[PDB]
Short mmCIF file of all heavy atoms in Angstrom, two decimals:
data_model
loop_
_atom_site.label_atom_id
_atom_site.label_comp_id
_atom_site.label_asym_id
_atom_site.label_seq_id
_atom_site.Cartn_x
_atom_site.Cartn_y
_atom_site.Cartn_z
N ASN K 2 77.77 132.01 51.37
CA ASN K 2 77.70 130.58 51.56
C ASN K 2 76.89 130.39 52.86
O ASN K 2 77.47 130.23 53.88
CB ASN K 2 78.98 129.81 51.60
CG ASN K 2 79.54 129.44 50.18
OD1 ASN K 2 78.82 128.96 49.38
ND2 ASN K 2 80.81 129.83 49.89
N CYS K 115 60.44 125.22 68.41
CA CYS K 115 59.13 124.48 68.85
C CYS K 115 58.30 124.12 67.63
O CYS K 115 58.10 124.77 66.73
CB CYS K 115 58.26 125.64 69.59
SG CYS K 115 58.95 126.29 71.19
N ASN K 116 57.80 122.77 67.79
CA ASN K 116 56.96 122.19 66.78
C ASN K 116 55.55 121.94 67.46
O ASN K 116 55.46 122.02 68.76
CB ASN K 116 57.48 120.79 66.39
CG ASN K 116 58.86 120.76 65.94
OD1 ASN K 116 59.36 121.73 65.33
ND2 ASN K 116 59.66 119.78 66.16
N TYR K 123 48.42 112.13 69.11
CA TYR K 123 49.71 111.36 69.39
C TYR K 123 50.02 111.35 70.76
O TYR K 123 49.66 112.10 71.71
CB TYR K 123 50.85 111.93 68.57
CG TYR K 123 50.57 112.26 67.13
CD1 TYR K 123 50.57 113.62 66.66
CD2 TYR K 123 50.44 111.24 66.19
CE1 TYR K 123 50.36 113.80 65.33
CE2 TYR K 123 50.09 111.52 64.87
CZ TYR K 123 50.15 112.82 64.49
OH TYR K 123 49.91 113.16 63.17
N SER K 266 69.32 135.86 64.38
CA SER K 266 68.76 136.92 63.43
C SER K 266 69.93 137.09 62.49
O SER K 266 70.93 136.41 62.15
CB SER K 266 68.44 138.09 64.34
OG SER K 266 67.80 139.16 63.43
N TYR K 274 68.44 128.32 60.92
CA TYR K 274 66.90 128.32 61.20
C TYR K 274 66.28 129.57 60.49
O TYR K 274 65.25 129.34 59.80
CB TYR K 274 66.72 128.39 62.67
CG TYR K 274 66.95 126.97 63.24
CD1 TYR K 274 67.90 126.62 64.23
CD2 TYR K 274 66.04 125.87 62.80
CE1 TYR K 274 67.97 125.32 64.63
CE2 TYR K 274 66.15 124.66 63.35
CZ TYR K 274 67.15 124.32 64.27
OH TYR K 274 67.35 123.14 64.76
N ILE U 5 80.70 132.56 56.65
CA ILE U 5 79.84 132.69 55.68
C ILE U 5 80.40 133.24 54.35
O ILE U 5 80.10 132.78 53.30
CB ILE U 5 78.55 133.66 56.20
CG1 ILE U 5 77.59 132.83 57.07
CG2 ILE U 5 77.94 134.24 55.03
CD1 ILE U 5 76.88 131.75 56.38
N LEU U 7 83.23 132.86 53.00
CA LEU U 7 84.42 131.94 52.58
C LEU U 7 83.88 131.01 51.50
O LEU U 7 82.66 130.57 51.50
CB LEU U 7 84.92 131.16 53.74
CG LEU U 7 85.55 132.01 54.93
CD1 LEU U 7 85.93 131.08 56.07
CD2 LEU U 7 86.64 132.80 54.39
N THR U 53 55.44 108.50 63.95
CA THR U 53 53.95 108.86 64.38
C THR U 53 53.74 110.31 64.56
O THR U 53 52.84 110.86 63.92
CB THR U 53 53.61 108.02 65.67
OG1 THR U 53 54.09 106.60 65.47
CG2 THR U 53 52.21 108.03 65.84
N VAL U 56 53.65 114.14 61.52
CA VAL U 56 52.67 114.83 60.57
C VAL U 56 51.63 115.53 61.42
O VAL U 56 51.09 114.89 62.42
CB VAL U 56 51.99 113.78 59.68
CG1 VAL U 56 51.34 114.65 58.56
CG2 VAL U 56 53.02 112.88 59.05
N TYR U 57 51.23 116.72 61.02
CA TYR U 57 50.30 117.55 61.82
C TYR U 57 49.33 118.15 60.73
O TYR U 57 49.76 118.53 59.54
CB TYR U 57 51.01 118.66 62.56
CG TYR U 57 51.80 118.18 63.76
CD1 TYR U 57 53.09 118.07 63.70
CD2 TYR U 57 51.12 117.73 64.92
CE1 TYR U 57 53.92 117.52 64.69
CE2 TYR U 57 51.77 117.28 65.95
CZ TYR U 57 53.12 117.12 65.89
OH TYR U 57 53.84 116.70 67.07
N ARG U 255 63.18 126.94 57.82
CA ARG U 255 62.24 127.03 59.05
C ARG U 255 62.75 127.87 60.02
O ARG U 255 63.74 127.69 60.87
CB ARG U 255 62.08 125.64 59.61
CG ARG U 255 61.23 125.54 60.87
CD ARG U 255 60.81 124.12 61.21
NE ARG U 255 60.95 123.87 62.68
CZ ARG U 255 60.06 124.44 63.56
NH1 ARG U 255 59.17 125.26 63.18
NH2 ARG U 255 60.11 123.97 64.87
N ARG U 265 61.30 143.30 62.03
CA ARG U 265 62.39 144.22 62.62
C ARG U 265 61.84 145.61 62.83
O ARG U 265 61.28 146.21 62.12
CB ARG U 265 63.62 144.27 61.56
CG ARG U 265 64.30 143.03 61.35
CD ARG U 265 64.81 142.39 62.65
NE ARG U 265 65.42 141.04 62.36
CZ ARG U 265 64.78 139.82 62.40
NH1 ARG U 265 63.58 139.89 62.83
NH2 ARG U 265 65.44 138.87 62.24
#
Side-chain angles (χ1 to χ4, degrees):
Chain K
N2 270 314
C115 294
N116 307 324
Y123 308 117
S266 191
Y274 280 118
Chain U
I5 280 297
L7 290 179
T53 312
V56 193
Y57 290 104
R255 172 168 146 66
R265 295 301 177 265

